[PDB]
Design a protein around this ligand. Structure first.
Ligand SMILES: [Mn+2]
Lengths: 95, 95
């Protein structure tokens, strides 16, 4: 399977916060779905190498490297390495 | 040394949130002072095996597993495995 998503914790009503663990197979590309205005997303690489397209530009992130950005803007996740990439996606929804 | 701490992101003023990576050497024990009242913490194991003491009780956590708990309680981290343990710690402060 190209992309396997698993919540690390259930939806957190108090913190308005989701925390997902995602494994992206070699060669897989995933485009973000739309989010509510004001959502903030953090991506942190756990293992492997991840390519993130943010503000129309690609960058490579290595383990324990991360990026914080506007989750409501189009972005993409891509694995151009030869092994799965495991990363976390944290989402803070606005109050 | 026994414990190596690294911020994954700098302090987030708007989200009142810290995010750290920690590596505990075999046999290491870290006893934290309780954080401010209302603080919520999450811990996720990246690799290895982590023991955590919450509510005066020890439990062992493995990769992909995590726990959410009240940060203003006393708690502790310990590595009783023969390998280092690498984990992430999230801290959310009250707004
Ligand atoms: Mn702590």
């Amino acid at each position: 399977q190209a992309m396997v998503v698993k919540p690390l914790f259930p939806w957190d009503e108090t913190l308005k916060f989701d925390h997902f663990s995602i494994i992206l197979a070699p060669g897989a590309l995933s485009e973000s779905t739309p989010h509510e205005a004001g959502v903030i997303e953090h991506v942190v690489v756990i293992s492997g190498e991840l390519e993130m397209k943010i503000d129309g530009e690609w960058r490579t992130l290595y383990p324990d490297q991360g990026v914080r950005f506007a989750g409501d803007k189009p972005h993409a996740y891509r694995n151009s390495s030869s092994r799965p990439v495991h990363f976390h996606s944290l989402i803070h929804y606005p109050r």
